[PDB]
Amino acid sequence: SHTDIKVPDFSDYRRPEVLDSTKSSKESSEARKGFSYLVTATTTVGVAY
Amino acid sequence: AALQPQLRIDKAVALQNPQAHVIENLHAAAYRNALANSLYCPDYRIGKVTPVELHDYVQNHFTSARMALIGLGVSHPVLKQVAEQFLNIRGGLGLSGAKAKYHGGEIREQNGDSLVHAALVAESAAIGSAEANAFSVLQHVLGAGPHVKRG
Amino acid sequence: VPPHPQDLEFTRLPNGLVIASLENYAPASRIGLFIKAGSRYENSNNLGTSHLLRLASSLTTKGASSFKITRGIEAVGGKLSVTSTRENMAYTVECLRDDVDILMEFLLNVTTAPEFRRWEVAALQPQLRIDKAVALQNPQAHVIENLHAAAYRNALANSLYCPDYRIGKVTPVELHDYVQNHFTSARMALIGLGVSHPVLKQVAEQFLNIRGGLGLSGAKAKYHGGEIREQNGDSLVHAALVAESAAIGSAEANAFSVLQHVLGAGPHVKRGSNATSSLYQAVAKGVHQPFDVSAFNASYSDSGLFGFYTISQAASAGDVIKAAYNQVKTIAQGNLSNPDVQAAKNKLKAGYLMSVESSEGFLDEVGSQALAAGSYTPPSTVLQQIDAVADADVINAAKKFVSGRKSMAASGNLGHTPFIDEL
Amino acid sequence: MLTRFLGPRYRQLARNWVPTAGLWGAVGAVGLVWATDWRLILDWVPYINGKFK
Amino acid sequence: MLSVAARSGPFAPVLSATSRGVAGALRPLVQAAVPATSESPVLDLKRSVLCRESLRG
Amino acid sequence: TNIRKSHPLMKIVNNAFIDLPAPSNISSWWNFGSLLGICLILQILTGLFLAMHY
Amino acid sequence: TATYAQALQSVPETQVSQLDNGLRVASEQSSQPTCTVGVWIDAGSRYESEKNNGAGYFVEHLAFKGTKNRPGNALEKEVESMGAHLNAYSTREHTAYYIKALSKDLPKAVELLADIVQNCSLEDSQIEKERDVILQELQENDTSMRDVVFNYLHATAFQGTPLAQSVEGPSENVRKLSRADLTEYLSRHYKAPRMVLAAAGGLEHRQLLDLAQKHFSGLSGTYDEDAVPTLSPCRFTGSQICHREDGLPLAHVAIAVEGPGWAHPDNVALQVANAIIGHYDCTYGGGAHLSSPLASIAATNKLCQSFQTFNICYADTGLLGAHFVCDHMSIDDMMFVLQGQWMRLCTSATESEVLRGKNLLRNALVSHLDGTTPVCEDIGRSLLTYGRRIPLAEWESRIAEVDARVVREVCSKYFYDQCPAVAGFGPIEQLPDYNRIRSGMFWLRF
Ligand code: HEC
């Protein structure tokens, strides 16, 4: 009965680099963390000024 | 729900007399049946007795033919009145003898406990019969409790 | 071409100690010190002492601290295990070949130099309550405790788990006492796999010359009988029915072991009707709901218990028991074919062989053989033993169970569970 | 009280943490240099020339 | 054939330094979990299920 | 175990500004409480630097 | 004497020969009186569709209940009567049927496996009986918090991929699966180039190959001429599943990063790092003195009833991490202490603890490979994953190569600043928020 629990489809929210179920996420983990960490690095740089 | 834990305290307070468990066990071993049941609730049942079980117990045991209304310092008309008005319930079991099948055997409880408690017993006689009165006399030939303080 | 297999070396020393080794050229090594020190040697004044003892294996020794035993064994990735039964304690030690020395030393300290420090024992007492709680969550553990307490008035009545009233009451002195008078040369066996005979003989000669305790393997099981009943609520009913049988090693026991396979042990096929299991087929005939039934066979130094064990719904309990019981009765009455026994022989023979195929099961067998017999009996002759059991002996084993003063333990809703009386 | 901290594990523990401890010093240096405007250090920097005479 | 594991029946407890505690021999079970509705006492202040020094390459 | 939970100074901070169980749905209208705290501190630092020359 | 090194060379080479079918037939010989024989199949749940999710699991229930040559009982009766044991299992990637029997009984053992694997009498009356059996087993599994959290972890980590599916399938697929559905998967998957006949014990590889041609040859004629299926990669998702149930007394939490898969050489270093952290359970006697810092902090502070590390491998992917069970108030501390150890290992792994990890692993590997059943399983699985049997000396070689640097390089590769898959069940109010869990995947000091 717990075997019916599938995770709801997330396609609506998924970053485009990880929309393909047949594609490894590792390929795009580097680039994806890059963006969000660049935003942060740029933010701190701005705050620092 | 809130009263369930009182079973564990109630049982703990009685069971601190070594005699209570001895007489529980004595009965569980004597009878395969109804008198085998203890006056205290088995641990596995605490918090498991349902509101329905008690409703059920009352509806089928607290009935007219299983009941007596005794009054001291009251009048007979008043007792008879409340009996006629409030105690006309019937719709449960009938038999005083759902029936004790005496069986026998022993129960042994290793304890550590300062000194040893042991009860040895055989089937005797149902209350009311002539035989029971002989047993009651036997009990005084052999010895009940003391009569003199420190004797 | 594999390597031509070596032969087991065996030696009884004059002092009564036994050494057995086998160089199996395995990448790992296993050493077991087996001791006649199981639960049966406890008395009514020191119950559970051999439980806490079993739990005490990494407390502080002369020559190795608690912390060393742990970190030392963990550093080399070995194990220190202790397995109690009603008759034996067995201290086992595993590691890679190159590391036998450090683990041996640890072994010897745990078994011969335990210090049992006041505060260390104090801190370990609560493990008895967890250890007991974790076992007792199998309904089978309490059933077999109770089965024994009812069967025997005596030594095998004692449980492998410590009675509740004893938890936090076992003294540092009680364990010192238990070791000094049970962990002695004449009550001991040092078994080694992936080790050499000279080395075992050396450590035996050097470190295991202890004697100053009890003598008898038979302080003596007085079989008595009767039943214990435990009202439970518990989903389904557990019941074991048993009579006194035969002491391990005797010819009679082998007949009982065959009887057990005629009637039915555990399953052989994953999810099956257990077609050859005559007990299972017998109950199934008139019980059309979830149940289990197996022949139960326990063999000891001076007594034995044979019968059957049942798992069933509360209301089916008495039907399941009566059906199982009558099935035994028919074998006592003479209703047993030659191929029926032949299959039981094959089931037993194969099962035994499989039981010793790994080094864990091998070492345990050589250990228990060393204590019960003072011998190593090769598989080749164990199979010959089994073969010598005739159909008439298996019948005679069933006849002994049927006509013998029963013992019974059971737990669940006992409302529809019979009473020996009514069997 | 310090003899307990000397042995092969601590030799490995120091080496494991030194690229990091060095890079935090570079952070602190650049950080101090940038914040106080240490024209002593900053004059020799190929773009930061706010002292443009 | 002398071992209370090889005569699959009576109880044996096992304790260890690195490994989980074991119990018992035989005794029904395994042919009691095929006739279903046997959920078993699961995790109510309890040890590790299965035991793991069976790790691979 | 956790240094951030059991230290008699960091514990008090943790239970007020870090691990505090807060509602999932509080509006931008709940921001003014902290913004008051910012305002109060801002007035102190400008206030003092003003009090130095006044 | 005999050095640990020499012992590894003494273990005989696993001999491999191939049938014209493509059935790889392999054995490890010994002087043992018994043996284990089996068929390992390259099939599981990862091959299933969503619309036939319990299919492999269903065949597993039908495989022992009758053939064309042995209707109903007959199989059991034969296996039972020679004293043999017959078992089966199915993971998401592999299905196996094996017989433990006497070495002399190997001719019938192989014969029966051939009949089971090729001539499954999927009688409609029996498939209906199995429907109830499997459905009842679904309700049974629900009560095992550990079986759930791992299915849940699979469901969330492999979101939308075939790997997200359980082995047993959902209830509706058990209720509606037909004989056609079953025969189709059977014919598409139980094909000879995806089957390994494995044996171990008192054997002769000559005698086994003879039997393999005698009983399995019958899959020739024509093969693979219309359709061939090869596995597609499965996307890992750093996600969370939280099943909040405040009526179960202990919390189960399983947390994992994406692992590399069966083939990858760096599974060894992972296993070593896992060995260091290890596993704990309330019945361990060591307590305070345990080497693994997590185990000792768990024991001292009773932070936990049990924890275990794992490196679950699938082709080109996996789950790397730990699972624990604990009281409601201890989830936070368990996570902190666990993630702190991953990071300690990622950044500052020391040489001696890496020896202990290597040592635990050599001991585990050698202890596991004890007896006909574990070794036969190892031959079958290895051939299906690695394409060969990796001999013990090679494992030792690859273990000895791992040092402190290897551990911290490899642990960082997989753990450092990576998104966990997190599955929680039971009294989980105190289970950290995903952001917080994800923040424990790095250190501000490093
Ligand atoms: C360090 C002492 C100090 C603190 C703290 C302080 N101030 Fe002041 N404030 C001053 C001084 C001095 C002046 C006069 C100089 C000036 O007008 O700028 C002043 C000026 C003012 C004025 C007049 C503004 C103008 O320039 O027209 C207001 C209004 C005021 N403060 C309100 C506040 C409030 C509100 C707070 C926070 C509760 C506060 N101040 C905090 C010292 C303080």
Quick check: CB of F47 below 6 Å from ligand 1?
yes
Contact C347 G79 (CB under 8 A): no
User: In chain E, which among 19-48 make CB contacts under 8 A with chain C?
Assistant: 19, 21, 23-24, 26-32, 34-39, 41, 44-47
Chain centre to alpha carbon of residue B89? 23
What is the b/e burial string over G31-40, where b = at least 16 CB atoms within 10 angstroms of the residue's CB? ebbbbbbbbb
* CB < 8 Å from G in window 2-31 of F: 2
DSSP string, G234-296: ------EEEEE-TTSSSEEEEEEEEE--TT-TTHHHHHHHHHHH-EEETTBS-GGG-SSHHHH
- The DSSP secondary structure of D28-41, one letter per residue, reads HHHHHHHHHT-HHH
Residue A39 identity: V
CA distance G361 to G345: 17
What is the number of domains present in chain E? 1
Angle between helical axes of C251-263 and C379-388 (0-180°, round to 10)? 80
C239, β-bridge pairs: C310, C410
**Which residue in the block uniquely carries the two structure tokens 């509080």?**
F26
List C-alpha distances in Å: B137 to B141, G57, G200: 6, 75, 81
* C-alpha torsion angle, residues D17, D21, D24, D26 (rounded to 10): -130
In ligand 1, the atom with minimum distance to the C-alpha of F50 is 12
Count CB atoms within 10 A of the CB of residue B24. Answer: 19
Q: Note the CATH number of domain G14-228.
A: 3.30.830.10
Q: Which residues in chain B have Cβ-Cβ distances shorter than 8 Å to C169?
A: 112
Count of all residues that appear for chain G in the document: 446
Q: Are G32 and C358 in contact (CB under 8 A)?
A: no
- CB pair distance less than 8 Å for E12 and C84: yes
Burial class (CB in 10 A: 0-12, 13-18, 19+), B126: exposed
Q: Least CA distance to C110: which residue of chain E?
A: E17
Residue pair C80/C33 in contact by the 8 Å Cβ criterion? no
End-to-end CA distance of chain A: 57
Specify the CATH architecture of the domain G239-442. 2-Layer Sandwich (3.30)
Measured distance CA(G214)–CA(G223) in Å, rounded? 19
- Measured between CA atoms, the residue of chain C closest to residue E37 is C290
Shortest CA distance to G80 belongs to which of C335, C298, C348? C348
DSSP letters along G94-151, please?
-EEEEEEEEGGGHHHHHHHHHHHHH-B---HHHHHHHHHHHHHHHHHHTT-HHHHHHH
Q: Which residue has the tokens 């994806």?
A: A32
Q: Residue F44: CB within 6 Å of ligand 1?
A: yes
Distance CA B34, CA G120 (A): 56
Rounded to a whole number, what is the distance in Å from the CA of E56 to chain C's nearest CA?
15
3 state DSSP class of C410: strand
The amino acid present at G339, given as its one-letter code, is Q
Domains and CATH numbers, chain C: 1-211 (3.30.830.10), 223-423 (3.30.830.10)
b/e sequence B30-63, b meaning 16+ C-beta within 10 Å: bbbeeebebeebbeeeeeeeeeeeeeeeeeeeeb
Taking the C-alpha atoms of residue C8 and residue G400, their distance in angstroms, rounded to an integer, is 33
**Which among G160, G171, G317 is the nearest to A4, CB-wise?**
G171
F46 pocket-lining for ligand 1 (C-beta < 6 Å): no
DSSP structure class, residue F14: I
Reported as type and span, the H/E element at residue G3 is none
**What residue type is assigned to position B67 of the chain?**
M
Cα of B101 vs centre of ligand 1, distance in Å, is 96
Catalytic-residue membership of G353: no
Q: Hey, which residues does C10 pair with through a beta bridge? A: C20
**F50 contacts F44 by C-beta, under 8 angstroms:** no
Chains D, G: CB contacts within 8 A come to 21
Q: How many CB atoms lie within 10 A of CB C403?
A: 9
Evaluate the CA torsion angle C387, C389, C392, C397 in order and state its sign. Answer: negative
With H, G, I as helix, E, B as strand and everything else as coil, classify residue A11: coil
Structure tokens that stand for C322 in this block: 């009566």
Q: b/e string for D26-42 if b means 16 or more Cβ within 10 A?
A: eeeeeeebeeeeeeeee
- Which of the listed residues F35, F40, F43, F45 should we mutate to test ligand 1's pocket, taking the one with most ligand atoms within 8 A of CB? F43
Would you call C287 exposed, middle or buried from its count of C-beta atoms within 10 A (0-12, 13-18, 19+)?
A: middle
The H-or-E segment that residue C34 falls in is: strand C28-35
Residue B143 at interface with chain C, using a CB cutoff of 8 Å: no
Residue G235, preceding peptide bond in cis (omega within 30° of 0): no
G84 phi-psi bin (left φ>0, alpha ψ -120 to 50, beta other): beta
Residue located via tokens 């009758």? G66
Whether residues C226 and B44 touch (CB distance < 8 A) is answered with no
**What's the per-residue H, E or C state across C81-123?**
EEECCCCCEEEEEEEEHHHHHHHHHHHHHHHHCECCCHHHHHH
Kindly state the tokens that stand for G276: 């260091």
What is the Å distance from ligand 1's center to F45 Cα? 10
Q: What's the rounded Cα separation, in Å, for the pair F36 and F43?
A: 10
Rounded Cα–Cα distance for residues C134 and G305 (Å): 11
| In this structure, CATH architecture of domain D1-53 | Up-down Bundle (1.20)
Report the run of H or E that residue G341 belongs to, with start and end.
helix G331-348
**Rg value, chain G, Cα:** 23
What are residue G219's phi and psi, to 5 degrees? -125, 10
Q: Tokens 């019948």 map to which residue?
A: C395
Beta strands in C250-356 (DSSP E): 291-299, 304-312
What are φ and ψ of residue C104, in 5° steps? -60, -50
Out of G28, G60, G258, G353, the active site residue is G60
C122 burial via Cβ count (<10 Å: 0-12, 13-18, 19+): exposed
Closest CA to C25 of C45, C2, C55: C2
Please indicate whether, in this complex, the C-beta atoms of A3 and G166 are within 8 angstroms of each other: yes
Count the neighbouring beta carbons within 10 Å of the beta carbon of residue G207. 15
Distance CA G19, CA G24 (A): 6
CA–CA separation, C350 vs G81, rounded Å? Answer: 11
Cα separation, D20 vs C209, whole angstroms: 58
The closest of E36, C150, B120 to G131, measured between CA atoms, is E36
- Measured in angstroms, the resolution is 2.7
Distance CA C367, CA C358 (A): 14
In whole angstroms, give the CA distance from residue C213 to residue C179: 9
Q: Give the integer Cα–Cα distance in Å for G305 and A16.
A: 41
Contact indicator for G280, G299 with CB cutoff of 8 Å: yes
Q: How far apart are CA G228 and CA A19, in angstroms?
A: 26
Q: Judge C/A contact: 3 or more CB pairs < 8 A.
A: no
In terms of residue numbers, what domain contains E11?
1-57
Place of tokens 């994406």: G258
CA atoms within 13 A on the CB side of C50: 34
CA of F35 relative to ligand 1 center, distance in Å:
18
Distance CA F8, CA F5 (A): 9
- Report helix, strand or coil for B56: helix
Closest CA to C300 of E7, E24, E15: E7
CB G407 within 8 A of CB G269: yes
Tokens of G74: 């007959």
Question: Residue type for G251, please?
Answer: A
- Atom of ligand 1 at shortest range from CA of F54: 12
Q: Note whether G152 and G326 are within 8 A (CB).
A: no
Task: Decide: A5 and G155 in contact? Cβ < 8 Å.
Answer: yes
Radius of gyration of chain E (CA): 14
Q: Tokens in use for C355?
A: 């039981």
Q: In what order do the strands lie in the sheet with G24-29?
A: G15-18, G24-29, G195-201, G34-41, G95-102, G85-90
What is the distance between the alpha carbons of residues B20 and B15, in angstroms, rounded to a whole number?
6
Q: How far is CA C310 from CA A25, B102, C402, G4, G432, in A?
A: 53, 26, 17, 48, 46
| Helix (H) or strand (E) segment spanning residue B84 | helix B76-86
Atom of ligand 1 lying closest to residue F40 CA: 37
Helices (H) and strands (E) in chain A, counts: 1, 0
- Which atom of ligand 1 approaches the CA of F44 most closely? 5
CA distance G237 to C304: 59
> What are the beta bridge partners of residue A46?
none
Break chain G into its structural domains and give their ranges.
14-228, 239-442
Tell me if F45 CB under 6 Å of ligand 1: no
Residue A12 main-chain phi, psi, to 5 deg? -50, -35
* Contact in structure between G250 and G305 (CB atoms under 8 Å): yes
The domain that contains A46 carries what CATH number? 1.20.5.270
Q: Are G122 and G58 in contact (CB under 8 A)?
A: no
> If you measure CA to CA, which chain C residue comes closest to E41?
C137
Quick check: C388 contacting G, CB < 8 Å? no
Method used for this model? X-ray
Domain that holds residue A46: 1-49
CA distances to C88, C177, C199 from C191, rounded to whole Å, are: 14, 25, 11
Nearest CA among G147, G318, G323 for reference residue G236:
G318
Evaluate whether G106 touches G198 at the Cβ level (below 8 Å): no
Secondary structure class of B65 (helix, strand, coil): helix
- Judge whether G75 is closer than 8 Å to chain C, CB to CB: yes
3 state DSSP class of G46: coil
Rg from Cα positions in chain C: 23
G residues 299-318 closer than 8 Å to F (CB): 301, 303
Give how far C147 is from chain B: nearest CA, Å. 13
CATH assignment at residue E11: 2.10.210.10
Taking the C-alpha atoms of residue C312 and residue E31, their distance in angstroms, rounded to an integer, is 12
Query: What is the residue whose two structure tokens read 């006992």?
Result: C414
Residue C207 neighbours by CB under 8 Å, 6+ apart: C108, C112
Inter-residue contact C96 to C76 (CB < 8 Å):
yes
